[PDB]
Design an enzyme around this catalytic site. Sequence first.
Site, PDB file in Angstrom:
ATOM      1  N   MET A   1       0.843  -1.178   0.000  1.00 21.15           N
ATOM      2  CA  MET A   1       0.000   0.000   0.000  1.00 21.15           C
ATOM      3  C   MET A   1       0.894   1.249   0.000  1.00 21.15           C
ATOM      4  SD  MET A   1      -3.446  -0.844   2.134  1.00 21.15           S
ATOM      5  CE  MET A   1      -2.645  -0.848   3.779  1.00 21.15           C
TER       6      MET A   1
ATOM      7  N   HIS B   1       9.263  -4.133   3.020  1.00 22.34           N
ATOM      8  CA  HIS B   1       8.779  -4.326   1.661  1.00 22.34           C
ATOM      9  C   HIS B   1       9.888  -4.737   0.697  1.00 22.34           C
ATOM     10  CE1 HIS B   1       5.977  -1.223   3.389  1.00 22.34           C
ATOM     11  NE2 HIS B   1       5.132  -2.157   2.991  1.00 22.34           N
TER      12      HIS B   1
ATOM     13  N   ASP C   1       9.215   8.492  -3.772  1.00 19.88           N
ATOM     14  CA  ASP C   1      10.157   7.817  -2.907  1.00 19.88           C
ATOM     15  C   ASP C   1       9.953   6.325  -3.126  1.00 19.88           C
ATOM     16  OD1 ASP C   1      11.899   7.294  -0.520  1.00 19.88           O
ATOM     17  OD2 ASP C   1       9.986   6.502   0.254  1.00 19.88           O
ATOM     18  N   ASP C   2       8.686   5.919  -3.181  1.00 18.30           N
ATOM     19  CA  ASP C   2       8.347   4.518  -3.401  1.00 18.30           C
ATOM     20  C   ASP C   2       8.935   4.014  -4.719  1.00 18.30           C
ATOM     21  OD1 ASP C   2       6.990   4.253  -1.032  1.00 18.30           O
ATOM     22  OD2 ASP C   2       4.993   4.621  -1.923  1.00 18.30           O
TER      23      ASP C   2
ATOM     24  N   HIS D   1       9.252   0.561   2.987  1.00 17.92           N
ATOM     25  CA  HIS D   1      10.403   0.525   3.873  1.00 17.92           C
ATOM     26  C   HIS D   1      11.126  -0.793   3.636  1.00 17.92           C
ATOM     27  CE1 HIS D   1       8.169  -2.368   6.318  1.00 17.92           C
ATOM     28  NE2 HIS D   1       7.187  -1.492   6.455  1.00 17.92           N
TER      29      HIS D   1
ATOM     30  N   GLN E   1      12.617   3.821  -4.868  1.00 18.95           N
ATOM     31  CA  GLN E   1      13.146   2.665  -4.151  1.00 18.95           C
ATOM     32  C   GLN E   1      13.003   1.385  -4.976  1.00 18.95           C
ATOM     33  OE1 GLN E   1      12.603   2.317   0.131  1.00 18.95           O
ATOM     34  NE2 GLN E   1      10.884   3.772   0.049  1.00 18.95           N
TER      35      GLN E   1
ATOM     36  N   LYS F   1       4.843 -10.724   9.206  1.00 19.71           N
ATOM     37  CA  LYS F   1       4.498  -9.793  10.281  1.00 19.71           C
ATOM     38  C   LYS F   1       2.985  -9.789  10.479  1.00 19.71           C
ATOM     39  CE  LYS F   1       4.087  -5.567  12.014  1.00 19.71           C
ATOM     40  NZ  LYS F   1       3.002  -6.572  12.210  1.00 19.71           N
TER      41      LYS F   1
ATOM     42  N   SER G   1       7.751  -1.720  10.441  1.00 22.57           N
ATOM     43  CA  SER G   1       6.385  -1.350  10.138  1.00 22.57           C
ATOM     44  C   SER G   1       6.347   0.154   9.954  1.00 22.57           C
ATOM     45  CB  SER G   1       5.470  -1.760  11.311  1.00 22.57           C
ATOM     46  OG  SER G   1       4.170  -1.227  11.165  1.00 22.57           O
ATOM     47  N   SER G   2       5.481   0.604   9.060  1.00 21.08           N
ATOM     48  CA  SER G   2       5.338   2.034   8.818  1.00 21.08           C
ATOM     49  C   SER G   2       4.798   2.706  10.080  1.00 21.08           C
ATOM     50  CB  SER G   2       4.369   2.284   7.661  1.00 21.08           C
ATOM     51  OG  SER G   2       3.086   1.796   8.008  1.00 21.08           O
ATOM     52  N   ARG G   3       4.207   1.936  10.988  1.00 18.63           N
ATOM     53  CA  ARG G   3       3.688   2.515  12.222  1.00 18.63           C
ATOM     54  C   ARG G   3       4.743   2.877  13.245  1.00 18.63           C
ATOM     55  NH1 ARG G   3      -1.828  -0.957  13.244  1.00 18.63           N
ATOM     56  NH2 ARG G   3      -3.069   0.180  11.665  1.00 18.63           N
TER      57      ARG G   3
END
Lengths: 279, 279
Positions: A40, A47, A79-80, A44, A83, A151, A187-189
């Site tokens: 989504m 991924h 950025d995505d 990071h 990468q 995860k 995690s993006s969190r």
Amino acid sequence: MAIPAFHPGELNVYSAPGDVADVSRALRLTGRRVMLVPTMGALHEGHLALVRAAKRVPGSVVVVSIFVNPMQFPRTPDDDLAQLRAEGVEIAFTPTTAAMYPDGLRTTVQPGPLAAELEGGPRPTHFAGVLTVVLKLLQIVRPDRVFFGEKDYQQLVLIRQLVADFNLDVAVVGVPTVREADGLAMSSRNRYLDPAQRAAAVALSAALTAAAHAATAGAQAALDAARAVLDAAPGVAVDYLELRDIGLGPMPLNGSGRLLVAARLGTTRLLDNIAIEIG
Amino acid sequence: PAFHPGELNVYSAPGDVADVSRALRLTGRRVMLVPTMGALHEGHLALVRAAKRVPGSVVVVSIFVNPMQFGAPRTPDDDLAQLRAEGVEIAFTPTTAAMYPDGLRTTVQPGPLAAELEGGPRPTHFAGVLTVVLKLLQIVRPDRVFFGEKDYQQLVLIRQLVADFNLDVAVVGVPTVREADGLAMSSRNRYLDPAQRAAAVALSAALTAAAHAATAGAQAALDAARAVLDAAPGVAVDYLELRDIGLGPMPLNGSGRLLVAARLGTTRLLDNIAIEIGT
């Protein structure tokens, strides 16, 4: 014979479902194996491990979709993509919500009862949104293999049920959780944790690893070790800590299983899980 | 392997027909799928013939009925004899266990249209249908799938399934076959006693009368149909509706569909017809 709209060796970005479906079908026809990594966005290292797992399959072309799916409820497109370019990914599928749900939520997927448990309690309709979008992505790209991180273990198990229950011709690959140097599951969190919370968050992985090794002394010992580690952390409200078999059903008297934990640090909810072997 | 050309090849295991279908497609023969519940009659033979008409095609006819215990009685022998006599090369006859090894877990949730018309008395009927059809499409991976127009709502819901889940198959609706007097062919007609069989002619007569009354507008067309049904002995009408061809609201003028469902004793009959309003 060149493939309409596809450039070998470069990051090809498609927004229309029909475009990536055509490109994927032509590529499959020439004998390449299509790998699909659904994400989504806001990518990071976690991924990137999925991307690399996909890339290392011989003769493969990697398709990474970026789609923030409204149905199952961070945005750096460049950025995505940048990468992904660096990883040698050749295809990025970035559809709009309009192109994916042109008729809103009409025909959808209803998961089995496992979807109402664990993560499903706090979010009862979440997994229906996940399986619906994953099914759609599988039909658009028609990959040989699809990659998901361990995860989100419950999610991975639910995707395996989706694939088995609808006879989907795709292999599902779970990729080990990528962690920070102290063990914190990526995690993006994590970015939402303040300094003290970041330090305290180490307790989740430490508790699970302690449990996995304490497991030679049985299930109570394993659970109790994890709990003791969690009890030594400040600000970690544990939502659940559950031992289950690998398919998330009841944990057998012995054998293989998975230990899962979910905790809230401030308003940030974190998850982790680990393979467990009893006795 | 496991496939003899020019003969009826019968497979029960999903994996067997999937392998054979995959192999036949590689050699360029397009795979046609005709899903049925068995108890074949002339109406089904018309689906088969339309599938056969496709130039380089191999026809797969599946026979399967969802287990009753799902809440949504015959031998396959005469049906197979029929298929063989009709020149079909593949029959897929799976057991309930092979279709549902993990039971009814992950399922398809149809859009709102499934709760209307036929869906009123049977809320989960279409979920069962779309679930099975999705599975058959994944197992056989045909280029085209054939359904009769008799079950118009079903046909429309199948087209939504294919669009909503981005399925790569063409859906072909085949015109209804009728008895000499207009009665739509159906395995249910055998359950009509003599008086009921005679009265049953009212359904098609009502629809045809409406189609021609249509020059005077939709309400006149509906009124003509209703009058014919009201004149029919022992026919209890469940519904009689004029809608759009996608089963949405019928516009001022333009194409549409008039659908009727009725009860003669405890035998429920259905029929529908194309309607051209102000034309």
